[PDB]
Design a protein around this ligand. Sequence first.
Ligand code: 5UZ
Ligand code: CL
Length: 289
Amino acid sequence: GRLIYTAGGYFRQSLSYLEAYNPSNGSWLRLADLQVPRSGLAGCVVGGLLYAVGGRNNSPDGNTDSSALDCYNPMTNQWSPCASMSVPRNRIGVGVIDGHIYAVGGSHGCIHHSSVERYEPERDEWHLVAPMLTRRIGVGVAVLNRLLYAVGGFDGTNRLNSAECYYPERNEWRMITPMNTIRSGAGVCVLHNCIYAAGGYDGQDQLNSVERYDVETETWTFVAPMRHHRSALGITVHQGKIYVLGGYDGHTFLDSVECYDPDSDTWSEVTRMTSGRSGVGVAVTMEPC
Ligand SMILES: CCC[C@@H]1CCCCN1C(=O)c1cccc(-c2cccc(-n3ncc(C(=O)O)c3C3CC3)c2)c1F
Ligand SMILES: [Cl-]
């Protein structure tokens, strides 16, 4: 079976937790801690390995933005460092295309990045690619049909409803239709032919709303809202269903995990994380041993 891995996050300070949830039986497993606490990171999987990318260690002894890439092997339950990115990237978004990891946007202190870089596991090397048209931190990233989408975020001055697409063979970014909602620190993922954007912060309030972009019609449509308003949520897809994990609702660091069934257009509570946290990294891969 395949598990939903949550890495890092934030509650009082940045966290080192790695925990795995099994939708088939409801169980949570605590696995090997990250070597360095981090929130505002992203997770992804390549070749069955789990990668934790970017973030920041918010800690009583100082705050340090992360350029780190670290690899977790479920076969061994061990974290291994990989090559670091060109720059620290807190509140990062990532996407995988053709076995390569794209790191998108994020912050380094007051620097809000438009830059983008690509990691090649076989070479353990990062290389910069074309920058986005917009500086974006708290950016949602997804991949559909081997194209990379950057959705919403914060540009240093304003939260954004805008979104853009990267065409790898042209090394070029182009704007797409903006969302109907300003969203920073949303969860963004792909399901079927659609890019979903769930929650986020609009400048005044945390959001429960969810909308999706159909690449064939170039339009965004709202679907059913989540049960919990949330920003800095984790999101992933497991067996054709969207899962959202944790985040902040303006009041509480949520332990709520919700899942979306596109066929019934309904959200339901599925489990609680072992403790409330925001700004996790999430991805799906095989069971450990
Ligand atoms: C010291 C951190 C406090 C912070 C902010 C105030 C509320 C308590 N805190 C969090 O819960 C938190 C902690 C770590 C990371 C994140 C995190 C993750 C991804 C994206 C963004 N992100 N990126 C742009 C924006 C924006 O506001 O436009 C955000 C916030 C709307 C989410 C933020 C956290 F939110
Ligand atoms: Cl932060």
